[PDB]
Amino acid sequence: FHVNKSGFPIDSHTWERMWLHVAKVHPRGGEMVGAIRNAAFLAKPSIPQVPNYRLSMTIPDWLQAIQNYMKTLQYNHTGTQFFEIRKMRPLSGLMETAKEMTRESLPIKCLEAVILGIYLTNGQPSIERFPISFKTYFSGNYFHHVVLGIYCNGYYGSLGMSRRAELMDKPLTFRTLSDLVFDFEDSYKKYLHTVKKVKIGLYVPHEPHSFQPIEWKQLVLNVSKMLRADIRKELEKYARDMRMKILKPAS
């Protein structure tokens, strides 16, 4: 679909394309678009305040504030992604885009939310962050989704954004990386998606090297071909290496 590459304000080419995609998708497209565009009395959306960690906060309450900020930005259902995310760009370049998301304050999709989640948790050394990617199959098509796994005080959880409430944030109550991943697999089932690939990245450093990117694919499992005990065996081995060993990036 469409990705804004023109900054803010969005330029005519990108803006007109956005409206043409939604007029097509929506059953009452033309009258829908006509009712919004140059409508004189649209509501001005509030600007949510950027959450910030203080010692007076539990880290679950802080993570909840981060997730609530992302939910307030809303999942982007327009078909036009407003912030370009080059996955392999250095972290320092991605954090400037995260900051731009806070300033422009627009809806976001799953990958933007992962970048945003890294940015809003960089201060805090008791949180380890690592991307969790899914390639799924539904009705003859492949789908790609990613969330931000988090590790804190022996527990696993996640931040993220999805069309589906069960496919983004998970509380910090998962005792193992496998329980977290399996919860996403079971959640995908509810939507008739089969998980083809699970990809787990490395910890995103709180203090990255100058050109250091995110490692998205340190572990790749073809889960649809594996029995669950083999999946758990591979995940727990890898998660144990994460928690101890310094692993060499695989990309």
Added chain:
Amino acid sequence: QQELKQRQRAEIYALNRVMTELEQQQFDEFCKQ
């Protein structure tokens, strides 16, 4: 220009609300089938 950014933001959020309701409706209709 800031005024254009604000105008665009207001239309983006009206549009996102409409597309969100559409996606919810389509989800429900697919469950019914």
